[PDB]
């Protein structure tokens, strides 16, 4: 009526457990080899005698007269890096200045080009991720920039995280303090005329916390031109003003120590040519600015909760509309589950008291190369850093229909959103508990 | 005429 | 009896799984486009052949002879900012002084007006949120105040967080220490004669931790006049008293460095014209004061746990009393769930040892502009800051009735309390597992 | 057989969902007004047409031929303060000295009296709560003590948190170090002859971590007399002893800077008149001391996990023995749940290195007024502070019986242990899913 | 029909509870003795009379006419060390230099050999674990290295955690800063010519966060030869260059204080003979380098979530294909569960500001023995340390078939992946609740 | 003869 | 007569 | 000629 | 000849 028979052993009734597990010493040796914990074979047999493979011949038979089903809970555990190549978090296109030249007697010829910089897999934490990006912009300048004109003064594109506009005085037209108040509010990207960044093929966008208000329109390009209204205002010549006590004030600090120009639009304007995203969003025209088509969001280092799909092709019936095949990247799905990664949050009031000390701690100002320029400076570390953290996930799918004849060797397969094994799985295993559902 | 691009002073 | 048929594939029995998911490469391209993760279409088909849309023609049929239902668990993930425009946490009305004038020979003409200040989306943490508010009060004074008389001495409205009354001596009538003990206890709002604040259209109220004891009476206005009993007492002239060793004591420090007046009611009284909410609450008449109609509550940065409602118009039967429609903002609801945001709490004994150091860390005293005035000073950072943090929510709704003919394309929709898509959704997807419930 | 009918809409079968929610824009306007999130009305109707109230006329009918029941999960969220009046954590009676007088030629007349001090709602954290208490003892002395004789030297009652007995030498009879080792172990309360404290009407007791071994005997009074054996030993005259190198030693420091007496019992004894609870507990007679009827327990700031009861008078059948009534404070109960408050624990090795720095951070020694007296000093901050933290609670009650005719307007009510609405509820809402249970 | 009888007591019906527990005072005395909490006996009897053993005679009988099953939830609690011998985390083979000699007139004879170093069980935290490893490399050099030639200059194999390549200048061919930027990015292992490490028999590999892209091919050997492309570049002679202001630059610092050679390949090249894994991975040929067959992963101190299997040989029926035996290491399995260990993550910006202070805190530079050599230096402590933490696990297995005659003494057994008791179990106990499933 | 009850010195 | 509203001294 | 392998200076 | 067992110096 509801048996469960196996080769030659006492028949069992009503229910039991078949175990899908990678570890088994025997099968690892033989079976999987060129496989990994995301696409492997395993014997469900569990009987000490019998050579695996020869096991493959045997079968667990759930009484034929009834349609069976089984509860499937699984234990999935990864250890995927915040920033890696497979997830698309190690690359990102941006347009920078390539050459600054003296041409055809009087012309200033500026040549800009798009280029894709890559990051060294792993390096978690958001802030640091920013830094690694800024550094990659530089590392490039080091291989092309300088040796083709282009000064530091005109480095296009830099990810910062502050509100260049806190000091700002509605009359002066300047950041009175003479310094862009060094506190971190949200990541944003700053651009110089003519350049900009593109994330079309990168989840890092999600790390900065900047998304399109219309996601499905593939094409994340944020040009200098887009950051309308909201160019970082200029600094008051704190020195002049004070010493001068008319009043100098109108004097908008044009350079800095080591004399770098703050590219001011004209000898008059209080504004600089440096455009900030964060500004355009909440300080620019809400109806036509950038706030119109992009959204200011919480960072999230994981870069985006993605899901993984399970499949047990040789043991569960194929769900409603999937068709059975043998193409690993199209197997039927039997369970979906978010990919095991969380955002742990911490507190480091030590940030920026630490950037200050961190710089001495790290024997180099590698990230802060321009410790004077109020722009190109090293963005403030925000209190509350986030870090992707891997965690085992004791998930639980529902009862799923089973085949009344379970093969000795079952194939287990965890796929990702785009349907492809996921290299970062360290442990995957599931427990199935069959039971009756109705009869034929 | 070589920029090491590094503030050695400090 | 209980089949589950699809186009031309083997019939399935008893149960299975239909998946509602946004990601699918095909549909994103075609279908949604002008949509977002809170109002999108998706094919439930999952069959590799067939052009989406042409998929739309097909249908999953749950045996007609029985009434089906399906378990619906979902995975929702947002990343909404502590302070943003859509949630109503970036604005707040307050009444400040606009002009101080010398008029009609002997009259002192004070003109006050209401005005709505806005904040720059994002900027989490409660303390800092306070600061951003205080700053907005200022930023306004900078554009209207000064250039119309009104000194700093008479800046109306400032959010602080301390107990101006710890030093207080029941005889002296003064805060003996000569300083309002610089420790943070709870946010409160201080007012000058004639002004005050209004939160009628803002959840920030909930951030300060001040609520009406009768919520539903739309209208949160807290006037200076309301803060009866409980005007910040004055400071002992620590210098005079000591040097003088009758005893000066009665001397209540009238100004401070840079000479700002502490607006004392009269040449006699030990009290200042500055009224504090926090005082009125626990130091004023309990029967008629403010403690009568407002409640001192725990802060909470999220500004208020709000819920979101799901709806699968084309797949579930319409719950008891909802009527079926096509107006996105009235679809039937099938599941309610709190909007994925928590209050992580941290410890920063570094607060106020940090405000002290934070000021040097941040190259500007932007928030502390009046580092002498014991009132207008920068509120102490409280130990234990809170920060809204986004978290994926693996929720689980119950079994819901299904239509016996599930369309190829289903429409998914997450709405908010007021019934409107929620821009801050990054990932939404659900798994439905149909099963029999009874027969016709 | 198992329908579910509504006015004039297609009948639904087997199950569905009725939603109890406060937010609804319509009902808030009309219905509740003078109510709050703990006692409100709401329409279950959910049909866009129909004026609420007129909605009230309609009804959801669960087929009559069967007894129905519904699963009731709810979402409760508060934000109640650690210390507030409603929970009984803002008051506490203690007996202090009122007057010290020179009488009838040679008599020293000491007059003691009981008095109830109150705290300013909110002020979380345990340590700080202690401080606020000690401060209230003082604040009183400031209004009565001094101006009636009584010196600081003889201030009765002070909550501390250290083991006055670590230095102690079994021979010397003194705390050799000359200082009561400044580390925090557990809160305790110290008393002078004749005085003491009473918590009979306060949960703060639970905050100090001192409970009766026989709870139900209403009456928590802890007299000086009770703290038998275990009077804080005295300090070695570190100065004398050393400089003197017989050996002075026997010299038990009688005062301190600013000359305050350590009330030593006699010119001989090494013990002081100051009695400590913590001492009596583990250093006094275990059979007759205080350890006999009180228990040393873990602090816990929440002051005591209390529960709240739900009630849906107009929608669920009245549970076994409750009788139906209309007295809000006796409605039948359908679900119990702990009141949403947890004890988050942190680490601040910064404690006492911070009290040391905290005192400079806070521009006043408001809490440490007697920085010399080894007793009246400011208790050490313990590493590991606790803080009540509010958290949304996604609870789940079981299936409960329903009435076969659900009214258009249901009344929701969350009560507390003593049966009274709870002002601190910000959000309450529940989802009910009816389903058959048997037939008539 | 569905009774449950016992010796001579009233029959019980439908269900009840049998308890499997180790603690019992009686049985511990007699029964187990030479056993442990992972392989013990226990009486299910629970009847105060009757000598255990004599209890063993009795039996709980579940009505014979029906096939029973029981829900089995268990409470498992361990306390296994991050690094211990049983889990294979205290050993690890590496190949180091043994002897440096002057031979046969002009030959430099280098003799290398493999050797297995062990660690002192316990010592959690990842960083520190690294250190303990590096130290073991040294401790060996101390017993063989020096006393056979080989200088410190040529110590093969050292686990570090930084990106020797941040300073790097694409033109100079040197790390301009003159210092390998002291910040931690990911663990990696550095090798000198001729040597290397092997983890074939160790999970520490998983601690470093370096795994094979093809796990099942037993054999983790990472030779110097493998770390192709990606030898730590050399340092700029910061001193020469500066003082010299042609420009020295080309000068690649050959030694350091205490004169140790940085083994530069030739008098010309800017590269050193030191090869870094981390470099090869993301800086070397992606198609043939190491990134081809190894994967950069998140650390994880637990070394690898392993599972444990339960078995109640004398109480549950043997699951599908297991055969009943008496060989403790082959008992049938009835439940699988991950071994109770998690990765708690913390923040210590104090790292490397602490290594700096930690060295003075620890009265010895035991781990930093070569505080000058930019390589052999002590790796930077990474912000965010991980620590294996033991946690009780309230797991829940499903209903499992039972024998209709439960013996007085049941045998409980928790096994591990390889099938062997696990010494680290402190508490194991389960609750079984039988109930009917069908009849015979 | 008034005790401010506050150590002004320190 | 212009208030920068900023304590430049400190 | 014995290396203690320890920087005693600092 | 009494050991206070306490390093008073430091």
Curated annotation (Swiss-Prot), chains A, C, D, E:
Other observations noted: All late proteins expressed from the major late promoter are produced by alternative splicing and alternative polyadenylation of the same gene giving rise to non-overlapping ORFs. A leader sequence is present in the N-terminus of all these mRNAs and is recognized by the viral shutoff protein to provide expression although conventional translation via ribosome scanning from the cap has been shut off in the host cell.
UniProt entry keywords in alphabetical sequence: Capsid protein, Clathrin-mediated endocytosis of virus by host, Host nucleus, Host-virus interaction, Late protein, Phosphoprotein, T=25 icosahedral capsid protein, Viral attachment to host cell, Viral penetration into host cytoplasm, Virion, Virus endocytosis by host, Virus entry into host cell
GO MF annotation list: structural molecule activity
Annotated organism of origin: Human adenovirus C serotype 2
Cellular component aspect of the GO annotation: host cell nucleus; T=25 icosahedral viral capsid
Protein name in UniProt: Penton protein
Entry superkingdom: Viruses
Free-text function comment from the UniProt entry: Major capsid protein that self-associates to form penton base pentamers, each in the shape of a pentagon, situated at the 12 vertices of the pseudo T=25 capsid. Involved in virus secondary attachment to host cell after initial attachment by the fiber protein. Binds host integrin heterodimer ITGAV-ITGB5 (alphaV-beta5) thereby triggering clathrin-mediated endocytosis of virions. Mediates initial virus attachment to CXADR-negative cells. Binding to integrins ITGAV-ITGB5 also seems to induce macropinocytosis uptake of the virus.
A Pfam family the protein falls into: Adeno_Penton_B
Cell location: Virion; Host nucleus
């Amino acid at each position: 009526r509801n048996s469960i028979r196996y080769s030659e052993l006492a028949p069992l009734f009503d229910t039991t457990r078949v175990y899908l597990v990678d570890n088994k010493s025997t099968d690892v040796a033989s079976l999987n080899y060129q496989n990994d914990h995301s696409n492997f074979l395993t014997t469900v047999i569990q009987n000490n005698d019998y050579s695996p493979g020869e096991a493959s011949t045997q079968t667990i038979n759930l009484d034929d007269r009834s349609h069976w089903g089984g509860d499937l809970k699984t234990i999935l555990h990864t250890n995927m890096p915040n920033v890696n190549e497979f997830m698309f978090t190690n690359k990102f296109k941006a347009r920078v200045m390539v050459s600054r030249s003296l041409t055809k007697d009087k012309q200033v010829e500026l040549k800009y080009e798009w280029v894709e910089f890559t990051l060294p897999e792993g390096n978690y934490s958001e802030t640091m991720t920013i830094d690694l990006m800024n550094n990659a912009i530089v590392e490039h300048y080091l291989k092309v920039g300088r040796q083709n004109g282009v000064l530091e003064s005109d480095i296009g594109v830099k990810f910062d995280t502050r509100n260049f506009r806190l000091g700002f005085d509605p009359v002066t037209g300047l950041v009175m303090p003479g310094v862009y108040t060094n506190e971190a509010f949200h990541p944003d990207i700053i651009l110089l005329p003519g350049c900009g960044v593109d994330f079309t093929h990168s989840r890092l966008s999600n790390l900065l916390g900047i998304r399109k208000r219309q996601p499905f329109q593939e094409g994340f390009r944020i040009t200098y031109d887009d950051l309308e209204g909201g160019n970082i205002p200029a600094l008051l010549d704190v020195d002049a003003y004070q010493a001068s006590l008319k009043k100098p004030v109108i004097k908008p600090l044009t350079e800095d120590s080591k004399k770098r120009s703050y590219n001011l639009i004209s000898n008059d304007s209080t504004f600089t040519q440096y455009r900030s995203w964060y500004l355009a969003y909440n300080y620019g025209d809400p109806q036509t600015g950038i706030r119109s088509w992009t959204l200011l969001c919480t960072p999230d280092v994981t870069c985006g909760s993605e899901q993984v799909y399970w499949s047990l092709p040789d043991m569960m019936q194929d769900p409603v509309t999937f068709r059975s095949t043998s193409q690993i990247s199209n197997f039927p799905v039997v369970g979906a589950e978010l990919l095991p990664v969380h955002s742990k949050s911490f507190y480091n009031d030590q940030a920026v008291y630490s950037q200050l000390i961190r710089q001495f701690t790290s024997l180099t100002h590698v990230f802060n190369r321009f410790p004077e320029n109020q722009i190109l400076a090293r963005p403030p570390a925000p209190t509350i850093t986030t870090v992707s953290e891997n965690v085992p996930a004791l998930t639980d799918h529902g009862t799923l229909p089973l085949r009344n004849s379970i093969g000795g060797v079952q194939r287990v397969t965890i796929t990702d959103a785009r349907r492809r094994t996921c290299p970062y799985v360290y442990k995957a295993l599931g427990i199935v508990s069959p039971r009756v559902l109705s009869s034929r | 005429t070589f920029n090491p691009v590094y503030p050695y002073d400090t």
